Amino acid sequence: SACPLRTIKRVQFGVLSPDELKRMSVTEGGIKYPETTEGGRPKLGGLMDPRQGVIERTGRCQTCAGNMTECPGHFGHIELAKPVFHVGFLVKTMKVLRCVCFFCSKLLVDSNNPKIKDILAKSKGQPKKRLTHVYDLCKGKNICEGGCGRYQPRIRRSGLELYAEWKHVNEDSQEKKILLSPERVHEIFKRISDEECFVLGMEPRYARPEWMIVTVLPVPPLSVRPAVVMQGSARNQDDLTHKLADIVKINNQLRRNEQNGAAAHVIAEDVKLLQFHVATMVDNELPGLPRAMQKSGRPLKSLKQRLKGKEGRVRGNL
Amino acid sequence: DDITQQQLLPGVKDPNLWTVKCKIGEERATAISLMRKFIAYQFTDTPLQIKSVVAPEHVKGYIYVEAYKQTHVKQAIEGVGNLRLGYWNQQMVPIKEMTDVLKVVKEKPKSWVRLKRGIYKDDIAQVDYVEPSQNTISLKMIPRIDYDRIKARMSLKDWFAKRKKFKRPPQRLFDAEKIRSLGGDVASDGDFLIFEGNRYSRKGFLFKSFAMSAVITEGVKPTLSELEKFEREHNFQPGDNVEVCEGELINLQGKILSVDGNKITIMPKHEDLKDMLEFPAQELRKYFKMGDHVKVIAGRFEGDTGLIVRVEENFVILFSDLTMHELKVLPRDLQLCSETASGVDVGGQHEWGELVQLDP
Amino acid sequence: KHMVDDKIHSRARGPIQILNRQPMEGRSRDGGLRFGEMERDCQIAHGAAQFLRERLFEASDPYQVHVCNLCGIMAIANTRTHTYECRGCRNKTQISLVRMPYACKLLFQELMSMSIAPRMMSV
Amino acid sequence: IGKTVTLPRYTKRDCSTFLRTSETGIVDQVMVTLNQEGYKFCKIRVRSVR
Amino acid sequence: LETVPKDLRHLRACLLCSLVKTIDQFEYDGCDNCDAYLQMKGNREMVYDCTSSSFDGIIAMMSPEDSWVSKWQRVSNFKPGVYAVSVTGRLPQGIVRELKSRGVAYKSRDTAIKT
Amino acid sequence: PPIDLQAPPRYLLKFEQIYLSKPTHWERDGAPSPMMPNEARLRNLTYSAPLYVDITKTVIKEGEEQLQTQHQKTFIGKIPIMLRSTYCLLNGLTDRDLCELNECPLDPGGYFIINGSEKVLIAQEKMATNTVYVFAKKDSKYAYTGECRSCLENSSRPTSTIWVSMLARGAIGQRIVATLPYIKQEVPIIIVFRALGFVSDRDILEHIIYDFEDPEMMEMVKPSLDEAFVIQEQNVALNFIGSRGAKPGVTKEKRIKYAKEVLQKEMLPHVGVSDFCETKKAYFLGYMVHRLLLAALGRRELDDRDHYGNKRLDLAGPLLAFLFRGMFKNLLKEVRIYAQKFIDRGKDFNLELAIKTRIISDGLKYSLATGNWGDQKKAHQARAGVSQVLNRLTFASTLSHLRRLNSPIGRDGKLAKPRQLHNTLWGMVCPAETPEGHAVGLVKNLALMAYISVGSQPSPILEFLEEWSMENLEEISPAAIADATKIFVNGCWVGIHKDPEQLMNTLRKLRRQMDIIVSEVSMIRDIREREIRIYTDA
Amino acid sequence: RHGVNRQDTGPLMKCSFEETVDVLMEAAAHGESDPMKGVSENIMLGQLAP
DNA sequence: CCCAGCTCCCTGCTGGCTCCGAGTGGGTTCTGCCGCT
DNA sequence: AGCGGCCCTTGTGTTCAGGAGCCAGCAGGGAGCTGGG
Ligand SMILES: [Zn+2]
Ligand SMILES: [Zn+2]
Ligand SMILES: [Zn+2]
């Protein structure tokens, strides 16, 4: 209340950097317990973290010390064991990958080139157009130039997996087709430079390509995924809560299989399952993939579905 | 041996390995049954063409088969109940990983644990010794003894018979004089004391043995009050000034841009140094300049803020805003935070500006 | 069967949905009528900006939040202690109160769950 | 239908069934039975003259 | 079927043969190919001293000559049977010396890495 | 099919016959009670009667030792009973009896009671099975497409839909290609015939065309022959089909085996599924191709999808039959799993413990309660709407609801063509009664005198035809087809005839006399064509 | 959706129209700012529209 | 001093993705269960 | 008694809105260049 009242002059969009997510989150060390309670006591490290908000009516938030109404939700976070592609950003990620090389992580076309200078001058304040034109040019190109002079493979998508397929690989026999991993993509994006990012069109201040890869999954507060006290004492958990529980279980399983030596194959399988779960949580309607099924075969409702269309947050509630 | 292993490396001509899903814990039985079937089938018209079968322990729910063709693996695995799920799909392990598959890796006292069921459930305990052969562990915890039961001289079997409507006793340190007054029999066996078939320590802790399955060894962490009754680490957070006490670059102060575990690998920003260095936790030290806010996360008076008039090598001195008294704390335990001390209450027992009735 | 007695319905600050604080639905629940999209558009045509604001914000789900002026994100505001803090910027003074629909707040939280920064520049 | 539930102003939470808001009438009749699982199960028919 | 272990209990792996059987089976028969040197049969103590109850994994060789995994485990020369992936411990020093006198090299079966 | 297991010991577990009791209800003491339909309504019970069967478990271990035991009246679940039906306890009760039982005599019944809620099954429309419909779809890459939703009399396998399309003009000519079940690619018709075992183009054209004096037909089919020439052997064609299969087997032998299985079982099941049905299958396929050629040349009008005579109404009979078939398959699978797991240890098992009556009972209850016609876990994949709550607002409303009809087209469709009132609906469907909402034209009602056949076995009709001058398809030679009149029975081309007029006269006389042909049977003679189609479908 | 959203109007307005999630994905990826000019944006923010 | 590759680019096609009016009143079923540990 | 898995029967299975338009990827073909003869 004491804070001065203000209107809104603009809304700046972007991607939450994992460090920013960690700083925001009140669930220090992330979340590691799929369970919600502990003998009727909401587990701090569980999904029903009291820090994240007020659980019961007439309670108060452990964080802001506010009752139901006054309390806004406070986020948590989950340190994904392995990097995971963000489904919503997948197409943009593929475009960026085609734009840069694997090794230099540099543009397949130099900024100083007259054509790219022209594109930059033309698409000022139009990062989408800038990205499309630069993507066309890098589609045209196939090597790295002050780069590594290497051969950029073609990127193919298959559901949630990406495949880099080399034609005329640099060496006599190095590799022909590789399942590119989210970790590899994240490393490439981190290696990418800020000026190259701006040329791509992504304002590095507000969106770095590496941020596109999920590493610190945000955790919506209880208010976003409220649990309803039932006529029976058994509280009913939200669909997002169940999906988060599944993701946490897979994450803990993978973390165990890492902390103790486990077959690279089972590690890959856990990574695949975690990727699928996160992708469904974001959007439970990706074609081809199986639909996340709550129980008795009733599909979940992802955030994308919440916001999708009529009867959604935007059209249905705003 | 290593040189010979080089000539023993796999090749295209050599038979391949395929992964097959299987039930959990039945790998040995499945392999033995498979061999009995193949030997029976040796004299038949269709002999199994698979060269070998592997049932590793580090891997669970999976068995590997060495064969010339997948159809050969399928034929070998057919007719096995535990391999019903596996028969639908056979995975081709890559050549590079085949060696890793064959490779195996072969490898605590005074640790805090909890119990699952029983009258001692939800009780923190400390480990004494573990016997894997017997599947039992020894836990020292705070005893739960009912004094009224001793006073009335009830049998343990009777107590268990009528346990349905009887409340469990609380946690309190064992006292021999109390039982002597109550009339119960107390026996002495060296350091330990025998009472009702149980060994009690002189201090008061109860030592008992329980099954590992009953005991909890995962997701267990004691509370500060529990540790008090029973009675390296670093505190580095973003936005804190640290000094490089050891190393070539000494007497340099940088900001904590990142945070990690054993090896923090911070990216400090030193004076007139745009570039960021790399230092581990041990090399990293927490140092602050004069006349600046400081907060103590852990210490004699934790959750306190003050200003430092000096900084000794190991005893930083600050004055608490709460009271005009000196407070010496470890520099590592000290932290820099421009934010004012929140002073949030623990357990939300009382709220700010809340009426209370100290006296009627 | 359709009789006026089974259809008459009215509301003034009744119970509200749990997910979003908007009025409940259906007269059996003492709900509120839906000021739909075409109603919004008709009011836009009328030019009744203030009435539209009342209908969609002040009469449906008025809400208040605190936002860091720097990063433009909702900040923890213990109004009791008047302790307003943004963890990311570690600041406490540059926090602004902002009135918005609870549905808008929920939308922003859901986006940030989708890992988006709908930063909120009060300047 | 005055109904209560035993808790885990004490030891009892109200779970009664009220007449639908804005409605009115007279209780036509009441029937009491046991559902498939022996639980007491009551149906009340209420008539209103329109 | 004799080479196959009789039951999953009292399992042991030879420190030299790298073969897996049960203690009773070891006493009755012993190693398929190690009988002349080990002389396991006829002495229960010899079975204990030559076989350890701690072992990691098992692989069955239907045709060691053409089995690459058998070549990797250096059990290709051995007749087909069930052989452990790795064994724990080492043979007695006296037996090592007798084997050296016999002209047969002794190699530890501890293939598993130690950490 | 009986379930056999191997641990060696082998079991048979064959079912013999069913026995259905009347609606009964048990309290805690185990007392069965006669649930008044009113009692079920009041206590939210389910008006169902327990079901029973006879089971024969024969065991063989060694020396062909038969351990045949029989368990009789094995309870297997409960079946909700449509009120006033034959097996309902109100059947044939006098009006006085109904008044005593507190049941309106005028109440028509025809609905179930699930947990005390009245439910009514809305008849669901669908394309008539075992028929050849030629549709022109210029929108697609096909000038024309013949289609047949073949389906055996009773079969857990759903209808196998086979298409025979003619590629739109534009290498040189137009080619005819068939899409088969379990095949992701079209197949040259000549290739299909050769796989069936017809290499001689003379024989193939004998099957397809019947008057070789028709250069129009014959030239129009030439391009298909040209496309499919290299494959001249049945084995080659079978290998081709196996390769085209969804998961072709590397082995040519296994590819051919898979293709042969697909042809024998998955293609035109109603024509036949047993071996040696190849001649019948080839003749039916040739007839389908002939229909396609006639439609392509305009000699025969395209079939109209909305023409109501080309539709069937799944009443509560077929719908419950489908649900029960799926559920019985599930029960058999579960019993198989249970018995297999126990016999794996050498120990025997109890079929009574193996049986889970809950499968059938709960599945029927859930389906009839939620209207989701299908497995509970496949709620979305199932089609809802069926089994609506009976509308008791008035007697007229109740009657209309009981006589309701539904088109499964889907309310979202904006095509006015299916929604439009059709001429065929005369006297069959009330032209006026229809919801005015989004579902206009899709939901209908039966005209007063309307009536829906429950189906019947065509065996007596086939026997009469055989006694008659009808000539078997295999018996006859291709030449006679041209002038003779084909005879279809539920889509099964059985044979031909030479005096269709007097044959139809005889059939109509028989039906009117109610001698061999029940009233429901329908007989049509397309005089302009040379077909006589007899339908006993439900 | 195409003709309207290809305009340089604003992510919030475009999302309110159609392809909400895709529009917001693009806005986040490119770090673009909605100038809070349009009536739809002001309505969503609950502040007096222009 | 042609010229067959080879690069670049444009056409055209196929295949994939999103949308399909607004509100209203009722009703029922369901939101785990069984095998394994 | 609590955790894990999972039933779509055809492991291989029918249409869970069909249809109407945009947009992306890729095959193909021609224009033009260029290191050999
Ligand atoms: Zn709060
Ligand atoms: Zn490069
Ligand atoms: Zn901030």
Numbering used by the authors:
A (entry chain A): 11 to 155, 182 to 354
B (entry chain Z): 163 to 269, 274 to 397, 416 to 544
C (entry chain B): 1052 to 1174
D (entry chain B): 867 to 874, 886 to 927
E (entry chain Y): 7 to 121
F (entry chain B): 63 to 69, 81 to 243, 251 to 618
G (entry chain A): 1416 to 1465
Give verbatim lines from the article.
U1 snRNP is the first spliceosome component recruited to the pre-mRNA to recognize the 5´ splice site (5´ SS). Human U1 snRNP consists of U1 snRNA, seven Sm proteins and three U1-specific proteins, U1-70K, U1A and U1C.
To gain molecular insights into U1 snRNP recruitment during transcription elongation, we assembled a mammalian transcription elongation complex (EC) with human DSIF and SPT6 on a DNA-RNA scaffold. The scaffold contains a DNA mismatch bubble that enables formation of a 9-base pair DNA-RNA hybrid duplex, and a modified MINX pre-mRNA that comprises a 5´ exon and a truncated intron of 34 nucleotides. The assembled EC was incubated with DSIF and SPT6, phosphorylated by P-TEFb, and purified by size exclusion chromatography before its incubation with purified human U1 snRNP and subjected to single particle cryo-EM analysis. Both U1 snRNP and SPT6 are highly mobile on the Pol II surface. The direct Pol II-U1 snRNP interface is mediated by the RRM domain of U1-70K which contacts the RPB2 and RPB12 subunits of Pol II, consistent with the Pol II-U1 snRNP structure. When superimposed on the Sm-ring, the 5´SS-U1 snRNA duplex moves away from the Sm-ring, leaving a larger gap between itself and the Sm-ring, possibly leading to U1C dissociation and explaining the lack of U1C densities in our reconstruction. Overall, our structure reveals that the U1 snRNP interaction with Pol II is compatible with the presence of elongation factors DSIF and SPT6 on the Pol II surface.
